Point group: D2
Chain length 115, copies 4
Amino acid sequence: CPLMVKVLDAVRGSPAINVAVHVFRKAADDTWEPFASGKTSESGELHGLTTEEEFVEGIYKVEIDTKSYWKALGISPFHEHAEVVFTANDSGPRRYTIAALLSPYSYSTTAVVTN
Amino acid sequence: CPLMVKVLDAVRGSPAINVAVHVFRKAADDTWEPFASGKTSESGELHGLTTEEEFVEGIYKVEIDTKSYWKALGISPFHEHAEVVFTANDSGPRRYTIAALLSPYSYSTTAVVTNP
Amino acid sequence: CPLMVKVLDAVRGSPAINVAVHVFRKAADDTWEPFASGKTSESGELHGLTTEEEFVEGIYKVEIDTKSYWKALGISPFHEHAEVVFTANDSGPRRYTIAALLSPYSYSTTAVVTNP
Amino acid sequence: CPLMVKVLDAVRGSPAINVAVHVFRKAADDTWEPFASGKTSESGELHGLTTEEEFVEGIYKVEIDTKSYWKALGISPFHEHAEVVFTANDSGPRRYTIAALLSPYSYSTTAVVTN
Ligand SMILES: O=c1cc(-c2ccc(O)c(O)c2)oc2cc(O)cc(O)c12
Ligand SMILES: O=c1cc(-c2ccc(O)c(O)c2)oc2cc(O)cc(O)c12
Ligand code: NA
Ligand code: NA
């Protein structure tokens, strides 16, 4: 798998567990088509979203359902979700990790792309 | 103005100048309708997007065109754009500052919300 | 003033008010000498720490007392304090804004440096 | 080992490799005493700094030598180093990960503390 998502909680200092994550691929008509999805594990990670065969060059969106995460912890959040939009490029490293660090009124996201 | 956007460049330690910003509002049919747009000034700030009257309750998306910014400083960056999606004014009018801190493979965004 | 500190609270989406800040400057003997201190206002900003005359070249440390801040909002936080260490004015006078964004187990800091 | 350090590079979208990291423990006289050190690996991680026996409650400082990292990449940085200061507390989770995300004029740090 060439795509992994990792989510951390800056309030609790913990992995963000059981966060829903939806991946979309941009279609020729510019709409976002569902591509893969899952929930983060006890380590805050979501593995196995896709395969090398399927993750072709294109524009992808990773939506992390942060609002539901915070609400389940009883904490009032700002954002509806965190969205990460990027082009997959075959000239670069093979493995993409999309990481996000969550707070109620702020988030950070980073891409770690490696060979 | 009840909505301001501020953008900083974490490589240079400077305001991010001339960053295009597009704001959308979710319509009754669930589509993202264009709401306002502009670009950051020499201070990295974008003022005057909207008015108290116009910025009603709704779900808003602030799209910050980071790729176009970094396609100009010689950095092929990772992201297409930073998208900030939030419900606004659902407990009455508030003032929102949407801040973003940009690097070529990473960004942070925070909201500062105040009650006038 | 050539040195300003701004602090935001990522839990509340607000300025971080009444945050104590201590600035030190490395002395010739390598010790950290007290240089200036203050606390953030209702805007989350701390102005007036120093002057152009006083803020000479050197290595400075800005200590932001985050634990004491969060020991007041009911959050036992992780860090003791955020420390920001940098060489200043070594190419002539500059204006420095040291910004920090606080969560109980994490913080970000960025510098915005401008030439007057 | 109860203490791990992980460092990422936000400019290159990569682990931050070969970054020097120094850990200190606060002594009774308030000085910082060297405790452990190393360099990050090809994964941006530094493992094996200490042991459960040695990492007793106390105040620790992790200094990450960011200036030298950026200079080796030919990039002009702001900070001398990034400093992370915290109390180790035996009531909490056993394992501490100190993570840092580096840019030339900015850094983020997070603690992930787990059982
Ligand atoms: O979004 C961020 C916004 C700001 C910020 C900094 C100065 C301001 O006058 C302001 O209105 C916002 O500072 C940051 C500082 C950080 O270290 C990380 C961040 O994400 C931000
Ligand atoms: O996105 C972030 C991701 C990570 C991160 C932390 C541990 C990992 O094993 C990893 O693969 C990524 O650490 C951060 C640490 C930060 O201080 C700020 C961030 O945005 C991140
Ligand atoms: Na309402
Ligand atoms: Na000089």
